[PDB]
Every structure is written in structure tokens, then in C-alpha cells.
């Protein structure tokens, strides 16, 4: 279950360079040059990497710190064959984003956070990146009266709107990814949900240019099904990029590496991801536990990688199984895929077998077999 | 606190009409004949009522029978000066919806959905309703490989597009509301919030003719902000109707009487309806305790009425107070209603003042003054 | 992964005789006479089956009725070898029970709760039943005024007495088992964790006659790690019985079949109950989902015995591999199982090595290695 | 609504101090010196503070530096009239605490851990402490193989142990209260709730010398009612201190100021404390929120006080109302706090009435009129 490039695994920079700084608790382990970071990754069979702002340019700095820390990262990069698909804006740590970014109560701080997102945008081009993500950690609330959402929705669409027309007039190719959290650091976040992303997209200038970036552990934080709602993405054609990691139910955003927390779930998620065709990266925005020194940070960032490796052979070995295969056809799911009224309305109006003489205790009566179905799907990821 | 025509206060059949029955226990109180419950509802100042057509019709009639229950209900209607604003179909409860109505895998399940929905529609517009309710419970899953997802969206696609052609071909001026739930009966149940909901219209053919119907206790089972949904709701312009109750967190749907829950949730969905200008029903969709007898069934029905009536008070004073006004203006809510950049990208591009010259340190030390606002919101909620 | 009898695998008589009747849905399935689900539990390989008195004996028959049932009964456990190793009372179907048993508010119904539970407590002991639990489903309230906790908890310590004094005046050897439950069907359950009944009991006056049944989805219904809630009551000598199934997180109650819902808890389970020489039943308290038809039934049932068995095989497979053994040692569980000072309180006052001259930056640094681990009993529950 | 010494209204150090730090967020705010809190405090009427060892004495303090900002804090004390009626300490931020304290694999952790805890109750016991709280916030795991959770238990007990052999040794006065917490800053903390630490104590060698000190926040994380289990510590005995603040549900610890959150839970809490006689500290344990400034710091301490007073009243003017207590008696809470069988276990098993001739339908027919008295409950919480 070794990785090779075409797995298009990649890591955000402030993953495994994580320092364990919890809302209870100091810095467990020293930062990491994000050099090191890029190299250690690519040993462990990583294809890319990705980044905030700050996160490769320490915020404030000089023009020729900016150049230095940028020559460095791309020596990097270029040493090991290490990509960048996808970059990012930091929008939440400073304390000037404490209302928010683009849906900050004050006008100035909602300009200037524009500003900071195109500087990185142009960054992001320049190292390659196809997708920019966008998480509005700071857009929401602790009390009722604090934000009208209405209005916060206005300014979320005209920055949004503003960040399509500079693409746009810059000749740049890359999309935007919304990337939904339904609350923490914020009460409650604005677009909680991949619904509420998808949703808000088809009311902007040029939706074309958006997608989502869906994580794992966030829409579990709102005890949704993450499976189902990467469904409905792939439905829309929006999924433009993914967060895989673990979450252990409705509690704080925990990150644990993928395969932990809801195993079942991350098996139906690589079996869809694997089905449908998705050709984007298979990023892990995770963070080693605390407990954790430098060796257990890349023990854990390995084991994303493994399990998404295990899971990929398991679910495939599932769908290519002809029992399964058998089990599928006696819960109708080939059914399921076949239009209902082909046929049209007026044929469905006429048709006296749809109702009038339809016999609803023995369509009633038909077992719908999912358990054996599901058994077998059990089987198959414990290799029973 | 007395209820007013102009409340346009409504409740569905099958709320004071609950049996009491449960998943562990039998009725605790006898069917009610629809005519009395429109008697009793209208004697508290309600002034309207919904209904499934199999509340309203026992599941299985001949067609006298039909008639019969219907004319007896026009005669209540009528009698009490009672208005039926919007209707549904039962597609939950017969055995044959166990897997679902529009994306149940059975296709002769699937068509006899809409066959049965359909006649309903009919009825409906008879009965004068604006708004027919579509609530998918049993389209969902236990088990990732019962429903493939994409598959179930097609065809849940394809009924809302049959159906949209059916009330365009009847002339019908009706039109749709779908109702999120995120689970139970089924596991996961498809369209879990409103974010899902509104991006799923979207993509039907004719989008004007739907909307969503949120319910407060559906979008608090994932523990998502129901205030804060219904903004957006509002926001796309597709608050059709509303589904008002409490609930106490993530949990079964409890469906307690409005007010009853989380009351501070309810008192800022008040003061947004009423902010916002809805101008729909203010439909009740709870169940009387089945700790209750028929008396407590009125007094519970009631309660729903006067904690609407004590919330628009209490809001519209806190709005409507100059301190109040005050408070809200040292939060900044008047430049959060400010666009950002009405001069345009390049002038912001080229604005010193949103960037290179944007004192970061003096903005991130403002305060918001949102908990004094919020104190100001909790003493007008208490008459303190 | 065939079941033994010495895996005392056993089945609630509700448990496969569920009719699939949930909030919004009639029955799925027909009835099944307990005769029947004998002979089928013990063909799959079960080893006993459980029942409250009424899942026996419908409710309100007359003594000839009654000895019919049991008759029929135990002709079946003779005929197939099955054992009766727990039974329990219905105190939540009928609507006498709308507001509790033990802590109804009414004086009447709390003394017919008990004397119903007698009656049953004597069938019990004649089937052969070492344990008898108590499931107080209705014991708690949806609103805060309708019970005084601190006298419902008197009134459930008294009854549990009474029933304490009466198994001890028949020389019986029967043993309680308390089932905890957070909520569903009451909003708030009394005694809703472990930890509350646990603490309950040492509050009895015979505190040795009672001991926890904890099942694996009431805990995860408060989110709470099923695996340490039963660690705790080993720790406290009190885990006389235990209910397994599934669940996917904090919703209503779904009984799953054991190994579904949470597929890592339930290895973790699994690995504690056999590592701690856990020695009662093995009881299933699930239901197949109302999708199911009678052969969907069975195969559920069989699917909860074959994932105890996996899961078993693996976690041995686990603690049994010397490259585990290793990374315990590495992570240090050792360490936790000596004394912390078992030199004693002043040897530790004197111990500059404890403080003093404690090096924390040291010991701060040491790595915990809990990923390797984890990722370690990932790999041999997948079997990679 | 203006708080008076008899109000008991207390404060710990961290909460008005903390600078506004959270898992994705730098400070927002200086740090407070603790002499300006104790006067700020004082003048808005609290009555107490509270304080970890690491909150009054900066880690790593020489014994001059020690001895300073102790004379300075007491000094401020004698300024004011402020009493320290509890304190605690730091097990959980440095680094070295990364996998607990007193339950920490390494065992030189462990017995650090109690050194510093006993430095640390030496000097609660000289500010004059009553309560020492232990709140074990890095006892717990993210992994099942990390933890052996009957060894933890083990290392528990003898930690306590070893505190209760200290305090006996010395003659203290001073109790402990054990504060649980299910989740946050580990995966799932080990005595999660008020019913786990109540169990936990009762194995104690000296029970009598702990109790627990519940928090608002934590009980609600785990979605369980915290009036019911305040309830259930007041009838063992054992609420020795408390912990006030809000929270929206299953999510993070948010630590709002106490009556934000779960409004309805506030007040039937103050309803229950004020009605149980509770005489100990009403101690805020809150964080205002990092969107504020040293202005709304104050405000929100302020309205955690105006809130609890509020409450108060409302509650004190429900109890008082004849038309509540006769609704009261409507429920029968009057017949909940009778014995149920004070006759005996003979004479229950003799009456008819409880039994043959108890007429089930009749009582279940009875209604329990909890939604007349809730709505009684409601227009007094609101002044209606
Ligand atoms: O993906 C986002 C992550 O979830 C957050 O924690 O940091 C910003 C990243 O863009
Ligand atoms: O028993 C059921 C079978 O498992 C399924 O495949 O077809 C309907 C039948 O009723
Ligand atoms: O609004 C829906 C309600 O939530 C459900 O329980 O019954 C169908 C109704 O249409
Ligand atoms: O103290 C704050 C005030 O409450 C707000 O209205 O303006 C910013 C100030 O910094
Ligand atoms: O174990 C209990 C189960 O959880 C409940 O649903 O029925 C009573 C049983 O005793
Ligand atoms: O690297 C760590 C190792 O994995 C553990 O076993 O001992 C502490 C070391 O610091
Ligand atoms: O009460 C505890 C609080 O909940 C925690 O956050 O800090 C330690 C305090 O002792
Ligand atoms: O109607 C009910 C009344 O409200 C209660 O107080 O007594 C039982 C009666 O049945
Ligand atoms: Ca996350
Ligand atoms: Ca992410
Ligand atoms: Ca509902
Ligand atoms: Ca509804
Ligand atoms: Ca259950
Ligand atoms: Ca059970
Ligand atoms: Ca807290
Ligand atoms: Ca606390």
C-alpha cells in the first residue's frame, strides 16, 4: 500500500507543521521549515503540497523576506518533483480578522482582506496552483444581534464577485473552492454546509468559476453523512477539490488522520470518489496529535495516505465482486438508475399500473435485502 | 397576546390530531374527527389548517367515502371562516415508501409517489392552498450501498421536474416547498438542511416554482443555526412557508411547541420574519406531548400562538429602542450593510488605504461591542 | 466465523420480532411467534434469548392464556437447547406508563409498575434468568416543571429496594442491571450515562443485587466512548450484562446490527471485553431495519455474530503481535499500569526527582507514539 | 438587578483574563494583571475569584517572584473585600501535560503532576479556600490502544489517595471537587460527566473529602440535561462548588456568559439551585468572547451576574404564584414526592388495588397537564 504520484496526495504546509497550540495548551513541537516539510513529504510518497499565505511568508514581512522564503520553497519543490494544485488565504489568525474577513462588521477590514487574498492569488498562479480555497473561519457569530445575515450574504457575494472579475482580468485559470465549516472558531459559521456552499454559488456573477472543498471531519461536526454530500458535489459538478482527515462525531474539529474517526464512512467516501471518476487532488488537511514528536508527525501523515490506499483496494475489490454484484441487482439499485417516467407525464397519468390497479401490498411485501448487501460490504473492508 | 386573523397562525391536521404514539409506546389518546380540530383551532384564534391527503382522507377510500370526508370538511371550513393554505402528501407511513416515494430503488414505487402525490395536488388547489409541501422522510439510507446518492438525485430531479409540468399543464398558480430533515426515519435522509434544499432547486427545470418550507427543529437536529438558515432562505428569495416548533438540540425530532426549546433561537427567528416582512403562514408542525389529555392538547396549541405573539413584542421593542439603535451602531451592523468596494476592483487595487498603508493593529484593537448589544437583546427578551 | 455456544451470543425476542413500526411508518413485516424466532436464532449459531414480559405473554391475558405462552415457550428451548439468561418488564408501551413507572407521578401507577415487575420477576427466575434488567424508558420529562428529579430519584431508589427486598425474601438468585439511556422517549431520561447509574447504585440499600447493562448506542446517543464507559464499570466490578448493536452518532436510537455505526468502537469493545474476561451474555439488542423483509431479518442477526467474531479475531491478532507489544511498550502503557507512588505520600513530599529537580522540557519532548500504534491496530483490523 | 455580597458571585482569574487565543486565533486582548481583575471585579459587585496556580504565580517563578505577586494579589484582596473561596491547578498547558497528569503514561509525570497540585493547595488553604477543583482536562485519548482505561482509573484513585492523605495530614479543611468534562482537549476525557465522577468518588479511601464541581458548558457538550444532573448531585450530597456559563449545544466549549446559551436550562437550573438551598459559591467559569475589547470583558462579566439575578426572580415568582402551585398539584408533583409503598413490600404484594384490580385505562386516560404548567413556566421566565 505504497503511494506513487498518480494518488495525487498532497498536504497543507500547517498539516504535519502543526505545533499542538490547542485552545488549553502551548506549542508540543517546534515549527518546521516548510523546506523540511516539502522534503519529508515527498520521502513518504506525497506528490504535492499546499499553503496560506502565512503560512510560507511569515505575515508582515519585507519585500526580500517575501523573495527569500518564496526562492527557498521553490528550490523545494523543484529538488523533490513536489507540485502545489491548490493555495490559500489566512483569514482568521490575525486579530484583525476577529469579525470576519470578507463579512467583518467593519468596511476597512473587509477591503484589506480582499487585498491580502488577491496578493496570494497571484502568488498561487505563480507556483501553479489550479484551485484557490477559500475558508470563511471568521464569517459568523456568537449572538443573534451581532450580524445580520442577509446583509453579511451581500458582502460575501461582492467579494466573492470581485475576486471572479480580477481572475477574469488577469487571464488567470484557476477556481475557487468555498470550503464549508458549520461552526468553531465562530459560534456558527456562515455557509455551514456543503448544501448551504453549493446553494450560495448559484447566486454569484460567474458560479462557473466556483466550486466547494468539502471536509470530512466538517460536515460530520453537524453529524451529516460526508459521503452524501460529496454525492450531491459530484451531482452539481462542483467538487473541485477535497479535505480528507477523521473526526469522531459532534464535538470541536479534531483533524485526526484519514481512516480514523468514522472508518465506514471514509470507505464509502473512496468507493464514491473512486466510482464517479474524481481527478482532483486527495488532500489531507489533518494535524498529528499533540502527543506527538517529529516521528509520529510523519507516522501519521503516512498513515493518511495507507488507509486511503487500503480503503481504494477494499471498496474496489466490493464493486468487482460478482456476489456483490448479484446483491446489488436483488436490492434493485439497478433500478434505482433507470429513469422513473421515461415515458412522459400523460403516459404516467394513463398508466393504470401506477396506481388504479397497483398492488401496494406486494411492491409493500418485496425485502429490500440491504443488510446482506451490507454485510458483504463489511466483509470486504475487514478482508473476511 | 390574543391571536389576530392578520397572524395568519395555521397547524397541520396531523399536529393536535397526534395519537401519541411513538417507537416505544401505544396511543394515549383517541383519533380526532378533522371537523373538531378545525373547531377547536379556529375557537383559539388560529386561521388555518394543512393537511396530508391521507389525514384528511383514510388511506384506501372508495370514492363516496372520499367525498363524504371532504364535503365535511369544506362544511367545517366554512362554518369556522378556516383557510387551508397548504397540503402535502403522505408518502411515509404505508409500507410500500419503506425505501421512499420519488427515490425509492422499486420504479413502480417511484411512479405510484408521484400518481399519489398528484391526485393530492388536485385537491389541494380545490381547497384553495398556495403551497404544496414535499417532505422526502423515507428517501435516504441505513447503509452506504442502498442508495447510490447521484442515482437517488436524478430521479428526485425527475419527479420535481413531472410534477412542475403537471401544475404548468393544470394552469395551477400552486407552487412547491421542500422540506429538509437530516435523519429519522431513514438513517441519513437526502436534502438534510435548507443549504441542500436550495441548491438542489437550482437544477429542476422550472426553479421558480419551488422553495423551501424549514422546519426550526429539522435544521437543530444537526445542530445548525435555524436563524441563520432562513436568512439565506430569504436571501435566495425562497421562503415559500415555514414549519414553526422547538427542540431541544441534536436528538430525535422532539416537535415541542414553539417557544418550548431553544427559546433565545426562537426569539431571533421572529425578529427576522417580522424584520424581513414574511408574509406566508406561521404554520405550527408540533406534537402535543403524549403525556397530554385533550385539554393539554388545546393548551399546548395555544402556548405555540401566544410565544409567537410575547417574541414579536419583545423583538420589535428591541429594534425599535434607541439604546438599541445605539448599540448597534457601536457593532458596526449599519457598515456591515455597506458594500465594500462599490468604487470598483481597480480603485481597490489601487487604495493604499485597504492595504499598504492599513493600520492593522489599531482596527484589531476596536472592539465589537457585541456583548453589550446581546445584553440589550437578553434584558428586552425578559422585560428586564 | 461460525458461532459456538461458547460464545453465548443471545437475542432479545424484540429484537427479530420487530415489526418494523417506527414514528412516521406502519408494520413491515408480519408478527413472529417467539416459537419460530427460537428455532431460527439457534440455527444461526445463537446460544439464548431474552424477553419482557409482555414480548411473551400479550398483555392483559388470562392465567390459562399465560401458561399456553409459557408452555409453548419452553418446548422450544427444549427442542433447540437455547438458553434464558435475562428477562425484563415493559414498563413503556402501555399509556398507563405515558409519565414513568417507578417514577410516575402518580402513587397508583408506581405501585403497579413494581407489582407488574414481580410477577415477571418470578417467571424469570423459572425460565432459568440469572439477571433482570430494569430499562426505565419512561422515567424523566419534556419539560422542566413536570418532575422534581431529587424526588424521582427517592422514588427510584425506593422501588429499586423493594424489588432488592423481595429477591432476597425468595432466596432467589437474581441479580439487577441497569440500562442507561440519555433520552428517546422521554427528552431527558433519569440514570442517562453509566456513570449516573453506576453512582444510583451505591445509593441502594443492597448495592451488591445491582449492576449496569450498558448499551453501545445509548452511549454514543450523548456522543460519550462506549469502550471507556464500560472500562469504568469493570473497573467497579458491576458489568453484569451488556447490549450490543450500532449506531452513527448523537440521533435517534437506530439499533443497528452490531458492527455497523461505529466500526472502530466497536473493535475497541470487542478488544476490552476479551482482554478483560468479560464472561456474560453476548446479547444483540438490535433492530433489523424495517427495509427488511423475514430473510433480511435473519441475515442481520447472523451479521451481528459474525462481527463479534472478526472483530475478536482481530483484536486478538492485535495484542498478540510482538511489533504491538513493541509500540506499548513504546508508548508506555506499561508505565500506566505501575503505582504512580506506591513508595507513599512522603517518599513522593521528599522526592526532589518528582519536582525539584523534575527536567519537564525532558520529558516534554518524548514523544508518545500513539499513531504508530493506532496505526498498527488499524492495519489488523483491516487484516493489511 | 444589582448583585450584593449574599449573592456569592464568583470569578476565576482566567476567565475576565483571557486574552482571546482559541485553536485558530493569536490574542485580541493584553493580559490582564490580576490586581486590576480583583478590582474591576469588585466594583461590578462579584464577591470572589478563583485562580490555577499559573494564573497568580507565571511557571517557572523564582521564590522571590512568587512571594511578590502573591503580596501584591492579596494586597488587592485587602483593598476590596474579595474572598478566594476556591482554586485549582494547571494540569494541562505546558507541554509536559500533552497526554495528562495524574493520568499521564509516564509515571514522573504523574508524580509531578501531584507535587504541584500540593504546592498549590498549600496556598489555596493560606488565601483561604474552601473547594480545591481538579479539572483533568489531558486525562483521556484520541486512540483506543493509548489509554488502558482501568489502569488510568487506577492511577486516578491513587492520585486522589494521595491528595486526601495530604490534606488529612495537615489538618486542612479545604475539600476537593472533581470538575467533569466529556470531550476537549482530548478525543474523550476520562470521568466525562457529573454521573462518571459521582461513581468514581464512591470508590474513593476517603469519599466523604470529594464531591464535584459541574460546569453548564460541559453537560450540555455531551447533550445532557445539566439541571437533571445538578439534581441528581444534590441528592448524593455532593455539589460542592458549581460552574456557570452558556453553550449552544454539541459543539466546542464556548464558555458564554451564564444565561446566554440555553436560556430555559438557566433558569430551571437557578430554579433548582435556589429552591435546593445550594450555599456555595455561584462561580463563573466564562470566556468573553475574543470579538470584544477590555470594555465588553466587563459587560459580559456583568451580565453573567444581571443574569442569574433575573433568573432569580422569574423562578422565585413561579414557585410563589398560587395559580402554579395549584397547576402543580394538577400534575401531581405533590403525589411524586409521597413514598410509593411506605405500607411495605407485603403489603404492596397484598393489595389489589396495585394490580388485579388497578384499572390501567382509567389512569392512562388521566392527562398529565405538563404543557399548562410549562406555558405557566414560560410567561413568568418572560414577565408575561
Ligand atoms: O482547509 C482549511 C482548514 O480546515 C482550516 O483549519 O485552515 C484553513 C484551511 O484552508
Ligand atoms: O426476499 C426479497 C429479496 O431478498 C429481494 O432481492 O427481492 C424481494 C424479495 O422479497
Ligand atoms: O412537515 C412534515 C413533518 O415534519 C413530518 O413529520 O410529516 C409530514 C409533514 O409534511
Ligand atoms: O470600545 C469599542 C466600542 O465599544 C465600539 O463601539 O467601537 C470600538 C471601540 O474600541
Ligand atoms: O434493553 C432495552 C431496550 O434498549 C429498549 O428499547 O426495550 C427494553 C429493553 O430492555
Ligand atoms: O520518539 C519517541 C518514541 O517514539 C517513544 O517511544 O519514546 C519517546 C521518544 O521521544
Ligand atoms: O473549571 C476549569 C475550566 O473548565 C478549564 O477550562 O480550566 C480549568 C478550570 O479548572
Ligand atoms: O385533564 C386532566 C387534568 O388536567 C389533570 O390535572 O388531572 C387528570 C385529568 O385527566
Ligand atoms: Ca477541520
Ligand atoms: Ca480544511
Ligand atoms: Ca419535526
Ligand atoms: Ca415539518
Ligand atoms: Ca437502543
Ligand atoms: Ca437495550
Ligand atoms: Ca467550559
Ligand atoms: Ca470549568
Redesign the interface.
Known amino acids: 500500500?505504497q503511494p506513487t504520484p498518480e494518488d495525487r496526495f498532497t498536504f497543507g504546509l500547517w498539516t504535519v507543521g502543526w505545533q499542538?497550540?490547542?485552545?488549553?495548551?502551548?506549542?508540543?513541537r517546534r515549527a518546521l521549515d516548510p523546506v523540511e516539510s516539502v522534503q519529508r513529504l515527498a520521502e513518504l510518497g506525497a506528490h504535492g503540497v499546499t499553503f496560506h499565505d502565512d503560512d510560507l511568508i511569515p505575515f508582515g514581512s519585507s519585500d526580500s523576506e517575501r523573495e527569500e522564503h518564496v526562492k527557498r520553497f521553490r528550490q523545494a519543490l523543484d529538488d523533490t518533483g513536489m507540485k502545489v494544485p491548490m493555495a490559500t488565504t489566512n483569514l482568521?489568525?490575525?486579530?484583525?480578522?476577529?469579525?470576519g474577513g470578507?463579512?467583518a462588521?467593519?468596511?476597512?477590514?473587509?477591503?484589506?482582506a480582499?487585498?491580502?487574498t488577491?496578493?496570494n492569488i497571484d502568488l498561487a498562479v505563480e507556483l501553479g496552483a489550479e484551485t484557490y480555497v477559500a475558508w470563511g473561519?471568521?464569517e459568523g457569530?456568537?449572538?443573534?444581534?451581532?450580524?445580520?445575515?442577509?446583509?453579511?450574504?451581500?458582502?460575501m457575494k461582492?467579494?466573492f464577485d470581485?475576486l471572479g472579475?480580477?481572475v477574469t482580468?488577469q487571464g488567470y485559470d484557476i477556481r475557487f473552492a468555498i470550503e464549508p465549516k458549520?461552526?468553531?472558531?465562530r459560534?456558527?459559521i456562515?455557509?455551514?454546509?456543503?448544501?448551504?456552499?453549493?446553494?450560495?454559488i448559484?447566486?454569484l456573477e460567474r458560479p462557473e468559476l466556483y466550486g466547494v472543498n468539502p471536509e470530512v471531519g466538517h460536515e460530520?461536526?453537524?453529524?451529516?453523512?460526508f459521503?452524501?454530500?460529496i454525492?450531491?458535489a459530484?451531482?452539481?459538478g462542483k467538487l473541485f477539490h477535497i479535505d480528507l482527515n477523521g473526526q469522531?462525531?459532534?464535538?470541536?474539529?479534531?483533524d485526526?488522520?484519514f481512516?480514523?474517526?468514522?472508518?465506514?464512512?471514509a470507505?464509502?467516501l473512496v468507493?464514491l470518489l473512486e466510482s464517479?471518476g474524481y481527478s482532483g487532488p486527495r488532500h489531507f488537511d489533518f494535524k498529528?496529535?499533540?502527543?506527538?514528536?517529529?516521528?509520529?508527525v510523519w507516522?501519521?501523515a503516512?498513515?493518511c495516505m495507507?488507509?486511503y490506499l487500503?480503503l481504494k483496494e477494499?471498496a474496489a475489490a466490493?464493486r468487482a465482486d460478482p456476489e456483490?454484484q448479484e446483491?446489488?441487482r436483488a436490492?434493485?439499485?439497478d433500478?434505482?438508475?433507470?429513469?422513473?417516467?421515461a415515458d412522459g407525464?400523460q403516459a404516467?397519468?394513463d398508466?393504470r399500473?401506477?396506481?388504479e390497479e397497483?398492488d401496494?401490498?406486494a411492491?409493500?411485501?418485496?425485502?429490500?435485502?440491504?443488510?446482506?448487501?451490507?454485510?458483504?460490504?463489511?466483509?470486504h473492508?475487514?478482508?473476511?
Open positions: 500500500y499542538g497550540r490547542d485552545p488549553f495548551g502551548d506549542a508540543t482568521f489568525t490575525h486579530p484583525v480578522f476577529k469579525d470578507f463579512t462588521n467593519d468596511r476597512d477590514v473587509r477591503r484589506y480582499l487585498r491580502k488577491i496578493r473561519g471568521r457569530a456568537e449572538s443573534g444581534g451581532a450580524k445580520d445575515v442577509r446583509d453579511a450574504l451581500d458582502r461582492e467579494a470581485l472579475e480580477y482580468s458549520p461552526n468553531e472558531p459560534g456558527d456562515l455557509l455551514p454546509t456543503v448544501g448551504h456552499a453549493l446553494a450560495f448559484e447566486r460530520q461536526m453537524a453529524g451529516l453523512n459521503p452524501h454530500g454525492a450531491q459530484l451531482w452539481a469522531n462525531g459532534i464535538k470541536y474539529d479534531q485526526l488522520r481512516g480514523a474517526g468514522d472508518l465506514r464512512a470507505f464509502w468507493d464517479a498529528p496529535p499533540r502527543t506527538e514528536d517529529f516521528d509520529g507516522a501519521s503516512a498513515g495507507r488507509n487500503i477494499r466490493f456483490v446483491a446489488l436490492s434493485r439499485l433500478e434505482l438508475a433507470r429513469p422513473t417516467a407525464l404516467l397519468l398508466d399500473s401506477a396506481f397497483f401496494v401490498d411492491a409493500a411485501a418485496r425485502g429490500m435485502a440491504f443488510e446482506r448487501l451490507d454485510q458483504l460490504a463489511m466483509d473492508l475487514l478482508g473476511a
